[PDB]
Design an enzyme around this catalytic site. Structure first.
Site, PDB file in Angstrom:
ATOM      1  N   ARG A 174      24.730 -53.144 -46.430  1.00  0.00           N
ATOM      2  CA  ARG A 174      23.635 -52.374 -46.250  1.00  0.00           C
ATOM      3  C   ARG A 174      22.642 -52.041 -46.835  1.00  0.00           C
ATOM      4  O   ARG A 174      21.551 -51.361 -47.575  1.00  0.00           O
ATOM      5  CB  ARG A 174      24.094 -50.775 -46.091  1.00  0.00           C
ATOM      6  N   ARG A 175      22.338 -52.648 -47.791  1.00  0.00           N
ATOM      7  CA  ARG A 175      21.907 -53.849 -48.771  1.00  0.00           C
ATOM      8  C   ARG A 175      20.500 -54.984 -48.514  1.00  0.00           C
ATOM      9  O   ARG A 175      20.589 -56.120 -49.489  1.00  0.00           O
ATOM     10  CB  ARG A 175      22.380 -54.161 -50.325  1.00  0.00           C
ATOM     11  N   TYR A 217       1.855 -61.920 -47.416  1.00  0.00           N
ATOM     12  CA  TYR A 217       3.542 -62.269 -47.173  1.00  0.00           C
ATOM     13  C   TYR A 217       4.336 -63.213 -47.677  1.00  0.00           C
ATOM     14  O   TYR A 217       5.630 -63.005 -47.694  1.00  0.00           O
ATOM     15  CB  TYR A 217       4.090 -61.747 -44.653  1.00  0.00           C
ATOM     16  N   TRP A 249      -6.155 -65.044 -40.780  1.00  0.00           N
ATOM     17  CA  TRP A 249      -6.623 -64.558 -41.629  1.00  0.00           C
ATOM     18  C   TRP A 249      -7.833 -65.562 -42.159  1.00  0.00           C
ATOM     19  O   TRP A 249      -7.976 -65.474 -43.778  1.00  0.00           O
ATOM     20  CB  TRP A 249      -5.516 -64.658 -42.529  1.00  0.00           C
ATOM     21  N   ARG A 299       3.183 -49.196 -43.178  1.00  0.00           N
ATOM     22  CA  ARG A 299       3.194 -47.464 -43.565  1.00  0.00           C
ATOM     23  C   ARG A 299       2.111 -47.411 -42.829  1.00  0.00           C
ATOM     24  O   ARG A 299       1.290 -46.255 -42.835  1.00  0.00           O
ATOM     25  CB  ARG A 299       2.845 -48.152 -44.961  1.00  0.00           C
ATOM     26  N   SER A 300       1.230 -48.315 -41.690  1.00  0.00           N
ATOM     27  CA  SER A 300       0.608 -48.266 -41.300  1.00  0.00           C
ATOM     28  C   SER A 300       0.064 -49.362 -39.925  1.00  0.00           C
ATOM     29  O   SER A 300       0.739 -50.217 -39.813  1.00  0.00           O
ATOM     30  CB  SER A 300      -0.678 -48.695 -42.330  1.00  0.00           C
ATOM     31  N   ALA A 301      -0.908 -48.825 -39.114  1.00  0.00           N
ATOM     32  CA  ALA A 301      -0.434 -49.411 -37.311  1.00  0.00           C
ATOM     33  C   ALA A 301      -1.874 -49.072 -36.539  1.00  0.00           C
ATOM     34  O   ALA A 301      -2.269 -47.547 -36.224  1.00  0.00           O
ATOM     35  CB  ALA A 301       0.450 -49.244 -36.671  1.00  0.00           C
ATOM     36  N   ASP A 302      -2.648 -49.801 -36.561  1.00  0.00           N
ATOM     37  CA  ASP A 302      -4.081 -49.811 -35.454  1.00  0.00           C
ATOM     38  C   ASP A 302      -3.426 -50.125 -34.612  1.00  0.00           C
ATOM     39  O   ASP A 302      -3.145 -51.789 -33.869  1.00  0.00           O
ATOM     40  CB  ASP A 302      -5.257 -50.685 -35.157  1.00  0.00           C
ATOM     41  N   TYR A 355      -8.078 -46.362 -33.633  1.00  0.00           N
ATOM     42  CA  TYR A 355     -10.206 -45.771 -34.147  1.00  0.00           C
ATOM     43  C   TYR A 355     -10.576 -45.130 -32.529  1.00  0.00           C
ATOM     44  O   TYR A 355     -10.472 -45.803 -31.616  1.00  0.00           O
ATOM     45  CB  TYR A 355     -10.594 -47.615 -34.768  1.00  0.00           C
ATOM     46  N   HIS A 370      -1.607 -45.457 -35.961  1.00  0.00           N
ATOM     47  CA  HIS A 370      -3.538 -44.649 -36.052  1.00  0.00           C
ATOM     48  C   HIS A 370      -4.365 -46.079 -34.436  1.00  0.00           C
ATOM     49  O   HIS A 370      -4.029 -47.022 -34.297  1.00  0.00           O
ATOM     50  CB  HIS A 370      -4.316 -44.876 -36.825  1.00  0.00           C
ATOM     51  N   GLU A 419       0.883 -68.142 -37.489  1.00  0.00           N
ATOM     52  CA  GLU A 419       1.151 -67.317 -38.470  1.00  0.00           C
ATOM     53  C   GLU A 419       2.672 -66.604 -39.352  1.00  0.00           C
ATOM     54  O   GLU A 419       2.516 -66.602 -40.544  1.00  0.00           O
ATOM     55  CB  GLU A 419       0.214 -66.384 -38.211  1.00  0.00           C
ATOM     56  N   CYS A 462       0.346 -54.001 -44.996  1.00  0.00           N
ATOM     57  CA  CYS A 462       0.467 -53.218 -43.464  1.00  0.00           C
ATOM     58  C   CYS A 462       2.222 -53.443 -43.619  1.00  0.00           C
ATOM     59  O   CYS A 462       2.961 -52.083 -43.064  1.00  0.00           O
ATOM     60  CB  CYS A 462       0.209 -53.206 -42.548  1.00  0.00           C
TER      61      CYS A 462
HETATM   62  C1  LIG Z   1     -11.458 -56.042 -42.723  1.00  0.00           C
HETATM   63  C2  LIG Z   1      -9.804 -55.597 -42.202  1.00  0.00           C
HETATM   64  C3  LIG Z   1      -9.804 -54.078 -42.381  1.00  0.00           C
HETATM   65  C4  LIG Z   1      -8.764 -53.409 -42.251  1.00  0.00           C
HETATM   66  C5  LIG Z   1      -7.849 -53.848 -42.384  1.00  0.00           C
HETATM   67  C6  LIG Z   1      -7.136 -55.357 -42.136  1.00  0.00           C
HETATM   68  C7  LIG Z   1      -8.663 -56.205 -41.832  1.00  0.00           C
HETATM   69  C8  LIG Z   1      -7.695 -56.993 -41.621  1.00  0.00           C
HETATM   70  O1  LIG Z   1      -8.470 -58.740 -42.027  1.00  0.00           O
HETATM   71  N1  LIG Z   1      -6.942 -57.123 -41.530  1.00  0.00           N
HETATM   72  C9  LIG Z   1      -5.357 -57.889 -41.408  1.00  0.00           C
HETATM   73  C10 LIG Z   1      -5.538 -58.465 -40.494  1.00  0.00           C
HETATM   74  C11 LIG Z   1      -4.054 -58.647 -39.639  1.00  0.00           C
HETATM   75  C12 LIG Z   1      -3.710 -59.163 -38.137  1.00  0.00           C
HETATM   76  C13 LIG Z   1      -2.972 -59.880 -37.453  1.00  0.00           C
HETATM   77  C14 LIG Z   1      -2.864 -60.346 -36.281  1.00  0.00           C
HETATM   78  C15 LIG Z   1      -3.428 -58.969 -35.556  1.00  0.00           C
HETATM   79  C16 LIG Z   1      -4.031 -58.065 -35.851  1.00  0.00           C
HETATM   80  C17 LIG Z   1      -4.143 -57.997 -37.195  1.00  0.00           C
HETATM   81  C18 LIG Z   1      -3.289 -60.106 -40.274  1.00  0.00           C
HETATM   82  C19 LIG Z   1      -4.015 -60.004 -41.726  1.00  0.00           C
HETATM   83  C20 LIG Z   1      -5.336 -59.299 -42.508  1.00  0.00           C
HETATM   84  O2  LIG Z   1      -5.458 -58.404 -43.553  1.00  0.00           O
HETATM   85  C21 LIG Z   1      -6.221 -55.630 -41.523  1.00  0.00           C
HETATM   86  O3  LIG Z   1      -5.569 -55.221 -41.136  1.00  0.00           O
HETATM   87  O1  LIG Z   2      21.974 -39.717 -51.699  1.00  0.00           O
HETATM   88  C1  LIG Z   2      22.854 -40.524 -51.214  1.00  0.00           C
HETATM   89  C2  LIG Z   2      23.429 -41.768 -52.181  1.00  0.00           C
HETATM   90  C3  LIG Z   2      24.381 -42.228 -51.969  1.00  0.00           C
HETATM   91  N1  LIG Z   2      25.022 -42.255 -50.734  1.00  0.00           N
HETATM   92  C4  LIG Z   2      26.211 -43.325 -50.500  1.00  0.00           C
HETATM   93  C5  LIG Z   2      26.244 -43.592 -48.793  1.00  0.00           C
HETATM   94  C6  LIG Z   2      26.664 -45.851 -49.442  1.00  0.00           C
HETATM   95  O2  LIG Z   2      28.200 -45.420 -49.057  1.00  0.00           O
HETATM   96  C7  LIG Z   2      25.766 -45.247 -50.316  1.00  0.00           C
HETATM   97  C8  LIG Z   2      24.727 -46.547 -50.385  1.00  0.00           C
HETATM   98  O3  LIG Z   2      24.982 -48.022 -51.240  1.00  0.00           O
HETATM   99  P1  LIG Z   2      25.718 -49.434 -50.207  1.00  0.00           P
HETATM  100  O4  LIG Z   2      27.294 -49.227 -49.652  1.00  0.00           O
HETATM  101  O5  LIG Z   2      25.234 -49.700 -49.488  1.00  0.00           O
HETATM  102  O6  LIG Z   2      26.357 -50.469 -51.688  1.00  0.00           O
HETATM  103  O7  LIG Z   2      25.703 -45.341 -50.837  1.00  0.00           O
HETATM  104  C9  LIG Z   2      24.422 -41.560 -49.420  1.00  0.00           C
HETATM  105  O8  LIG Z   2      24.841 -41.543 -48.655  1.00  0.00           O
HETATM  106  N2  LIG Z   2      23.297 -40.522 -49.569  1.00  0.00           N
HETATM  107  O1  LIG Z   3      -0.340 -56.217 -38.523  1.00  0.00           O
HETATM  108  C1  LIG Z   3      -1.694 -55.363 -38.712  1.00  0.00           C
HETATM  109  C2  LIG Z   3      -2.701 -55.085 -40.200  1.00  0.00           C
HETATM  110  C3  LIG Z   3      -2.936 -54.591 -39.875  1.00  0.00           C
HETATM  111  N1  LIG Z   3      -3.348 -53.333 -39.420  1.00  0.00           N
HETATM  112  C4  LIG Z   3      -4.278 -52.325 -39.848  1.00  0.00           C
HETATM  113  C5  LIG Z   3      -4.315 -50.538 -39.096  1.00  0.00           C
HETATM  114  C6  LIG Z   3      -5.008 -50.078 -40.412  1.00  0.00           C
HETATM  115  O2  LIG Z   3      -6.246 -50.024 -40.317  1.00  0.00           O
HETATM  116  C7  LIG Z   3      -4.852 -50.750 -41.458  1.00  0.00           C
HETATM  117  C8  LIG Z   3      -3.613 -50.599 -42.800  1.00  0.00           C
HETATM  118  O3  LIG Z   3      -3.910 -50.656 -44.225  1.00  0.00           O
HETATM  119  P1  LIG Z   3      -5.496 -49.315 -44.326  1.00  0.00           P
HETATM  120  O4  LIG Z   3      -5.780 -48.720 -43.503  1.00  0.00           O
HETATM  121  O5  LIG Z   3      -4.227 -48.073 -44.807  1.00  0.00           O
HETATM  122  O6  LIG Z   3      -6.387 -49.285 -46.155  1.00  0.00           O
HETATM  123  O7  LIG Z   3      -4.440 -52.399 -41.255  1.00  0.00           O
HETATM  124  C9  LIG Z   3      -2.293 -53.540 -38.335  1.00  0.00           C
HETATM  125  O8  LIG Z   3      -2.674 -52.269 -37.624  1.00  0.00           O
HETATM  126  N2  LIG Z   3      -1.133 -53.997 -38.227  1.00  0.00           N
END
Ligand SMILES: Cc1cccc2c1C(=O)N(c1cc(-c3ccccc3)ccc1O)C2=O
Ligand SMILES: O=c1ccn([C@H]2C[C@H](O)[C@@H](COP(=O)(O)O)O2)c(=O)[nH]1
Ligand SMILES: O=c1ccn([C@H]2C[C@H](O)[C@@H](COP(=O)(O)O)O2)c(=O)[nH]1
Ligand SMILES: Cc1cccc2c1C(=O)N(c1cc(-c3ccccc3)ccc1O)C2=O
Lengths: 306, 306
Positions: free
Chosen positions: A172-173, A140, A82, A212-215, A255, A253, A60, A192
């Protein structure tokens, strides 16, 4: 031991996590903004307290790394991870009674697991059927290697970043983003794995993921492994050794279904973690396939049925 | 005390941070992926160990919140905090000898500080000069409130997100991004404040910022304050009380110049932190101006000259 962070995040959630419902009626327990650090130099972060399947995670990962979004490659490696979302978007296409197979996949599993094998095999050899229904589109592989622009051109973020690791290790970019504001308000999965970033520290390649989010039961152990594999491949490509993988979440999280499962696991003691060997004569992680990547000494506890 | 995290990140960098140079020859000391947590319910995160100017930080925040990218608003509030980059891009426009004023602003400060006041005043009343040279273009106000799309339309991320806080407090999709892959390879400033996300927890609005880069002396104290002010305004707008602000960095750094300054500060003891009062009869953080926002009990140590 290397994998403790995973076990501590599992316990911190049951103990002190907060309750809320979700988009189906099942319930979660969660916490905002928790980190995990894994020194990759002391081994490789695959859970010994639950067998995680590395075979899949590489297939994957190399997929993404090719920038493909098409379920085929995944199938010809025996990875149905998938399938589901593709299958999903074949039942409601003008051309398809599997409507809402999700909410009742667990009460009929002889028809689904067969009408999912039909889809699977037609996608496996039929070009014109794959190209329509095998293609996830926005996932991805696109964001990482072919981000769609404004003046309709395409960007290989990860590519550019990799050259940039070679060029300016100390930038840092060094960021890659899967979060496209234009795609997320109407989309299959708003990525995610939001955002990651490299960082180079006297020889060592580090990487930190903003997720942002994690099972924590089903998803995280996988995630941890892709993203370390990701960190190894790139260091390897740049001649760098391996630093830390740093795993940061917004909402992590559990479930309510998985409460007992994880508890059992929590009773297990981690084991010496494994080792990655990589083919030391390729350094082009884009044309990597499976045998270039070797796990040494993986000794897990049994998988946990879920 | 509330601001300890800032002092601990300052000490962890001198003590165990790693050396590297930068894009001028001055040197840094840095660490990858360090968090900071600030419970907003126990006060407001403005440093008492160094006077931070709140006046500016509000003006500059409400700017972003209007979605303006034009230095004027900032000037009519007596805030020259983004002058520089505007000024910069007026010396090399076809129409302007201040070339590289940066590397030697500190050795002539009577001409610059005057040719910067010319720019400043022409921008302050001349419409056609402002519109060309006052406009930064690509900066927090655009990405936050007017993200440029593909089919050339515009998106107010923060807007949509705010409605979504009202609508689905428990979403894990409450993200705002300043990272546009299409803009960052040729750009003034690739947004230092990369990404943030809300999260709602029995009544309390939390927020976590992913900051790719940070000057711990000059930048961070400011950042901490905008982003808490940001967290207050929104909770206020949604009827929520105030949770945690969670500050995560990739590269947090100190330049070698600031080694002594910060050391002195490190000798200072934090003081009871202050309080925010907000006008409890507006709840539209977009049409906020300065007097709707009040700091109570700010008792800092002296500013530190830098
Ligand atoms: C149906 C439904 C509902 C809520 C949330 C997800 C899904 C779902 O299908 N996926 C998902 C999981 C993985 C994944 C890959 C390795 C391990 C565990 C999960 C990869 C791709 C995905 O789209 C969700 O995160
Ligand atoms: O609110 C801010 C705005 C800018 N920087 C600075 C720190 C780094 O030197 C630079 C980041 O840009 P690069 O150096 O990574 O190019 O900005 C902060 O620390 N806080
Ligand atoms: O690699 C992954 C892919 C998906 N999720 C799951 C956890 C959340 O339930 C969902 C995030 O989407 P939202 O529920 O926030 O819509 O995906 C993971 O934990 N790890
Ligand atoms: C010239 C140059 C070089 C490197 C790095 C920065 C700058 C610069 O001008 N800025 C910047 C700082 C702030 C800022 C605002 C409050 C406090 C501290 C800094 C606001 C906007 C900015 O563009 C840099 O980060």
């Amino acid at each position: 031991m290397l994998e403790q962070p995973y076990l501590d995040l599992a316990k911190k959630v049951l103990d002190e996590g907060h309750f809320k419902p979700d988009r189906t009626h099942t319930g979660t327990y969660s916490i905002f903004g928790h980190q995990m650090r894994f020194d990759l130099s002391k081994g490789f972060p695959l859970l010994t307290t639950k067998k995680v399947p590395f075979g899949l995670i590489k297939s994957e990962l190399l997929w993404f790394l090719h920038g493909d979004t098409n379920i085929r490659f995944l199938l010809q490696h025996r990875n149905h991870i998938w399938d589901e979302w593709a299958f999903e978007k074949w039942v409601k296409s003008d051309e398809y009674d599997m409507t809402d197979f999700g909410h009742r996949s667990q009460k009929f599993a002889a028809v689904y697991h067969e009408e999912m094998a039909k889809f699977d095999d037609r996608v496996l050899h039929d070009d014109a059927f794959a190209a329509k229904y095998g293609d996830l589109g926005l996932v991805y592989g696109s964001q990482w290697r072919a981000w769609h622009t404004s003046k309709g051109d395409t960007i290989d973020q990860l590519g550019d970043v990799i050259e940039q690791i070679k060029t300016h290790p100390y930038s840092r970019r060094l960021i890659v983003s899967a979060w496209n504001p234009e795609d997320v308000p109407t989309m299959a999965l708003p990525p995610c794995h939001t955002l990651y970033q490299f960082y180079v520290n006297d020889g060592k390649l580090s990487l930190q993921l903003y997720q942002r989010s994690a099972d924590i039961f089903l998803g995280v152990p996988f995630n941890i492994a892709s993203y370390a594999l990701l960190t190894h491949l790139v260091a390897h490509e740049c001649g760098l050794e391996v630093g830390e993988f740093i795993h940061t979440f917004g909402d992590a999280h559990l479930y309510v279904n998985h409460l007992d499962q994880i508890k059992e696991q929590l009773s297990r003691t981690p084991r010496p973690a494994p080792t990655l060997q990589l083919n030391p004569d390729k350094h082009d992680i884009f044309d990597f396939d499976m045998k270039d990547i070797k796990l040494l000494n993986y000794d897990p506890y049994p998988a946990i049925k879920a």
